[PDB]
Amino acid sequence: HMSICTSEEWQGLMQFTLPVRLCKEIELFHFDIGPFENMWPGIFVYMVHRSCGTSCFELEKLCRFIMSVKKNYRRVPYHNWKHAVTVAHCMYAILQNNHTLFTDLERKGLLIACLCHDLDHRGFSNSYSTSTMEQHHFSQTVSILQLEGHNIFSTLSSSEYEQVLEIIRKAIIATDLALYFGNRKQLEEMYQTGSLNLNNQSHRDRVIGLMMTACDLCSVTKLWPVTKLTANDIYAEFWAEGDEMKKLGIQPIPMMDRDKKDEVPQGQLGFYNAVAIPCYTTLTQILPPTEPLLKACRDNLSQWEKVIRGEE
Numbered sequence: 100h101m102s103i104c105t106s107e108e109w110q111g112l113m114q115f116t117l118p119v120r121l122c123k124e125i126e127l128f129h130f131d132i133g134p135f136e137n138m139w140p141g142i143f144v145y146m147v148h149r150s151c152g153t154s155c156f157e158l159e160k161l162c163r164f165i166m167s168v169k170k171n172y173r174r175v176p177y178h179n180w181k182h183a184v185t186v187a188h189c190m191y192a193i194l195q196n197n198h199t200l201f202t203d204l205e206r207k208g209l210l211i212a213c214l215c216h217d218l219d220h221r222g223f224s225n226s227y228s229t230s231t232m233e234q235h236h237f238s239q240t241v242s243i244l245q246l247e248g249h250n251i252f253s254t255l256s257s258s259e260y261e262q263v264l265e266i267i268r269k270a271i272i273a274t275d276l277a278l279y280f281g282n283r284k285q286l287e288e289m290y291q292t293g294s295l296n297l298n299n300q301s302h303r304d305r306v307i308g309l310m311m312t313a314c315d316l317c318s319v320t321k322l323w324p325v326t327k328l329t330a331n332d333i334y335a336e337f338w339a340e341g342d343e344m345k346k347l348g349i350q351p352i353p354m355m356d357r358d359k360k361d362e363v364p365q366g367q368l369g370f371y372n373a374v375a376i377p378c379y380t381t382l383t384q385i386l387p388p389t390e391p392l393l394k395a396c397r398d399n400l401s402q403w404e405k406v407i408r409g410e411e
């Protein structure tokens with residue numbers, strides 16, 4: 100277990116250059132990687148390069164690492180390689196727009212953590228100690244790092260190496276949405292009381308934790324026709340899970356039931372109000388430059404309202 104890339108795959112990636120007409124596009128929060136499948140591993144290399152230059156990773160081990168990650172994502176409609184890269188791009192925009200808050204270690208850890216955060220997702224929920232899927236996705240990240248010529252951190256001291264693995268573990272654990280409700284609440288209080296202090300490691304962990312939810316949910320921050328299409332992918336998976344439950348004579352909850360299709364826009368609306376809006380509001384409060392994520396979220400919420408009210 101742990102599949103690996105071929106030499107053709109890592110060498111082809113080493114040779115890629117992003118077309119000039121995307122370089123301004125890719126800096127924008129709402130950028131959609133969607134139309135550029137061929138370029139996705141290339142796009143990740145690019146973002147690593149912009150954010151730490153052409154000498155932050157041995158370029159060969161880097162391309163090998165990315166191409167093996169890709170081969171350990173499965174061909175599922177939503178929790179796949181497309182979503183890893185989408186989440187990593189959101190993290191890239193955040194780090195670029197907040198350039199001096201984060202250490203060099205943090206920047207490398209979090210881009211890698213984002214690409215690996217759904218490693219070997221099967222297309223079924225946590226429901227079908229806790230943070231099950233996530234402890235596992237971290238486990239798989241550890242295994243790839245450990246292979247052959249795939250250790251991109253080899254050139255760190257053992258003190259830095261232990262540091263970056265622990266950035267990664269906490270980051271991927273933070274992508275379990277059950278834990279997001281409490282982290283956010285904690286952050287909301289600290290901000291209120293004025294007690295938030297980025298010199299404090301456990302405060303940094305929390306902020307980073309929120310940053311991982313915001314990236315993980317970022318398909319709600321793209322332009323309306325892209326968010327709409329992604330929502331179809333999320334449903335392809337949820338309904339396939341609901342179909343497997345009916346196969347056993349089990350009644351799935353409404354969200355996994357394709358017979359409950361007309362209650363889609365209502366469902367979307369509640370999620371936006373209950374999860375997405377508070378997430379990007381607390382983020383915007385701590386990191387003002389992330390404000391365009393909130394704005395794009397608000398715009399998509401009002402699209403969903405108009406669907407419900409019957410006008411699009």
Ligand SMILES: Cn1cc(-c2ccc(=O)n(C)c2)c(COc2ccc(-c3cccc4c3ncn4C)cc2)n1
Binds near residue numbers: 362
């Ligand atoms: C980008 N993105 C990730 C996610 C996401 C991430 C983590 C997570 O745990 N969930 C559930 C979703 C989303 C929102 O997706 C949604 C899916 C279904 C609903 C829904 C709720 C209730 C009844 C419903 C619903 N749909 C049909 N009916 C009848 C809402 C939102 N967008």
Ligand SMILES: [Mg+2]
Binds near residue numbers: 232274275
């Ligand atoms: Mg996940």
Ligand SMILES: [Zn+2]
Binds near residue numbers: 182216217274315
């Ligand atoms: Zn995810």
